[PDB]
Amino acid sequence: GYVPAVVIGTGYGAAVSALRLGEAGVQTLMLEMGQLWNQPGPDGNIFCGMLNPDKRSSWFKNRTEAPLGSFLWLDVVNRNIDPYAGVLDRVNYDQMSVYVGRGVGGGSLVNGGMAVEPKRSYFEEILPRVDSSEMYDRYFPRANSMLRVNHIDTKWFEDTEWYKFARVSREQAGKAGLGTVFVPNVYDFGYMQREAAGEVPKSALATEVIYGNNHGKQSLDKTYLAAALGTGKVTIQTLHQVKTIRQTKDGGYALTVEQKDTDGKLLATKEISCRYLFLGAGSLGSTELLVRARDTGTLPNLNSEVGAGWGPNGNIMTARANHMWNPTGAHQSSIPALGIDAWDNSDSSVFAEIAPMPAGLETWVSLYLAITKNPQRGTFVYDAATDRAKLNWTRDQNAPAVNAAKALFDRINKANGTIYRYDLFGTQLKAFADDFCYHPLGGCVLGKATDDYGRVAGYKNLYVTDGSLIPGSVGVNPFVTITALAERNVERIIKQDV
Numbered sequence: 458g459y460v461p462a463v464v465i466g467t468g469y470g471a472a473v474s475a476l477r478l479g480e481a482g483v484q485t486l487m488l489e490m491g492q493l494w495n496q497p498g499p500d501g502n503i504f505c506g507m508l509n510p511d512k513r514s515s516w517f518k519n520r521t522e523a524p525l526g527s528f529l530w531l532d533v534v535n536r537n538i539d540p541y542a543g544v545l546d547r548v549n550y551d552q553m554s555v556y557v558g559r560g561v562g563g564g565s566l567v568n569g570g571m572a573v574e575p576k577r578s579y580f581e582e583i584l585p586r587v588d589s590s591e592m593y594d595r596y597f598p599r600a601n602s603m604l605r606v607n608h609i610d611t612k613w614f615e616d617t618e619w620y621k622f623a624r625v626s627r628e629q630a631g632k633a634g635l636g637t638v639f640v641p642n643v644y645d646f647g648y649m650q651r652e653a654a655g656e657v658p659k660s661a662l663a664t665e666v667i668y669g670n671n672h673g674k675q676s677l678d679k680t681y682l683a684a685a686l687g688t689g690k691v692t693i694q695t696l697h698q699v700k701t702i703r704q705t706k707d708g709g710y711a712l713t714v715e716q717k718d719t720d721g722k723l724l725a726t727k728e729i730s731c732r733y734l735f736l737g738a739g740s741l742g743s744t745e746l747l748v749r750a751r752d753t754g755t756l757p758n759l760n761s762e763v764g765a766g767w768g769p770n771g772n773i774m775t776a777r778a779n780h781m782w783n784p785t786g787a788h789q790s791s792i793p794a795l796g797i798d799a800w801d802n803s804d805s806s807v808f809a810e811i812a813p814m815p816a817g818l819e820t821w822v823s824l825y826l827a828i829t830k831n832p833q834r835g836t837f838v839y840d841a842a843t844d845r846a847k848l849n850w851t852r853d854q855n856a857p858a859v860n861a862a863k864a865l866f867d868r869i870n871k872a873n874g875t876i877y878r879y880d881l882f883g884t885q886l887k888a889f890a891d892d893f894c895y896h897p898l899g900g901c902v903l904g905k906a907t908d909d910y911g912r913v914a915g916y917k918n919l920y921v922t923d924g925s926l927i928p929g930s931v932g933v934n935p936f937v938t939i940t941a942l943a944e945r946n947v948e949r950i951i952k953q954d955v
């Protein structure tokens with residue numbers, strides 16, 4: 458049937474948009490292809506942990522996988538599973554695997570909670586058409602508050618065994634003249650203290666994050682989406698995947714929407730129509746919908762920039778072997794708290810999170826997820842044969858990212874007389890994982906495929922809201938930027954268009 462506004466997806470862009478639409482009195486339906494994660498599973502928990510993965514860990518795979526970096530210790534817990542509507546989806550393209558959340562809340566379900574504002578001078582470089590004063594004066598603060606960002610207590614951090622891994626890398630980086638920064642988070646750090654004291658059920662301190670957190674983490678279902686539902690003007694339908702978008706003959710948009718069960722069985726195909734259509738299906742999902750619509754003739758006026766300008770936020774993973782006298786600890790909080798900020802906007806820039814490892818025994822490994830400045834971009838190209846977008850990115854396009862990460866970590870190795878690990882990412886000697894992405898950015902870039910507020914070029918009342926708007930790189934963990942940009946966009950769209 459018809460609803461005034463439809464929002465596709467329930468990640469950051471979608472959640473912001475729906476809240477503000479509902480507050481404006483616009484009846485809004487959100488369509489989410491994954492589950493509402495609120496049913497206790499076979500262990501009494503909603504989500505599986507990293508040491509006990511089961512079908513809930515994976516979107517339609519037949520075997521669980523170890524978190525990247527952890528195969529040497531966590532392959533032993535891998536098991537065959539039924540293909541199921543689980544929470545984490547590794548999407549495999551030719552030479553890149555992109556990890557995304559599937560469920561009410563999108564990537565907020567599976568992410569590390571790290572809530573980081575980009576450097577203003579870098580924001581100004583990547584998005585020169587956007588007024589940066591309103592972003593920093595109004596929209597970043599708005600996002601910060603709504604997301605429930607909080608800050609770790611420094612004394613507790615310094616003292617606790619759960620962050621020894623972070624302190625070890627801080628000391629090692631310091632010998633190379635590199636400083637660290639605390640990383641704000643949406644995981645409740647007060648709750649985390651009480652986990653360590655045995656006062657509340659553990660989540661971060663029980664090797665949970667990437668398949669969800671049963672406690673502590675303020676994912677979007679608890680923040681923006683709960684508020685959106687609270688308006689009385691928003692509903693969310695789950696296990697509903699939008700497949701096609703067209704402009705109807707009488708105006709507005711019509712969607713074909715597949716309803717499935719958690720086993721992936723097709724239950725129904727529905728036609729849903731609306732006046733205002735907001736895409737929040739992510740960098741991958743929104744871009745796929747639009748290249749499909751262009752190339753199958755259902756939105757024939759979409760421009761040539763739809764699909765273009767994708768990058769992996771310069772994501773590279775690497776690891777160092779510590780000296781025997783610098784163990785990182787058997788007990789590592791699953792939520793990072795420290796990063797190495799070596800980002801000055803030059804081509805050598807690196808902002809690296811000091812990543813915990815889940816092994817639960819001493820390995821002497823320090824793990825890092827580097828964010829780099831690499832100008833290479835890929836393009837999503839629709840394949841009509843399979844009805845899927847393909848990502849034209851080649852592994853050699855990550856060479857500048859590897860080079861920047863390696864230059865930084867080489868400084869740390871030189872200062873400390875340490876070497877890389879070469880065995881964490883497969884049998885072949887490989888110190889730098891260069892074909893994964895947790896932070897997909899672009900495909901429907903702001904000002905290129907859209908106007909400066911995400912209005913899709915060629916169409917009225919058609920909006921993109923999410924990571925597909927960002928031109929490939931933000932220099933930091935991206936969700937705060939996506940959220941703040943979505944606050945800016947929806948406020949303007951409601952004022953001018955609704």
Ligand SMILES: Cc1cc2nc3c(=O)[nH]c(=O)nc-3n(C[C@H](O)[C@H](O)[C@H](O)COP(=O)(O)OP(=O)(O)OC[C@H]3O[C@@H](n4cnc5c(N)ncnc54)[C@H](O)[C@@H]3O)c2cc1C
Nearest residue numbers: 466468469470490563564569570571699742924934935936
């Ligand atoms: C392992 C991991 C760790 C991360 N850690 C951090 C971190 O600590 N901090 C940070 O800033 N970022 C982090 N990120 C990145 C962050 O989670 C993403 O940048 C963010 O979630 C993107 O928001 P979005 O709104 O673009 O899309 P998403 O959050 O990906 O949401 C898109 C939603 O749309 C749904 N959907 C897609 N297609 C359709 C369709 N056709 N029909 C219906 N529904 C659809 C999806 O199922 C999903 O729920 C991490 C991500 C991962 C995977």
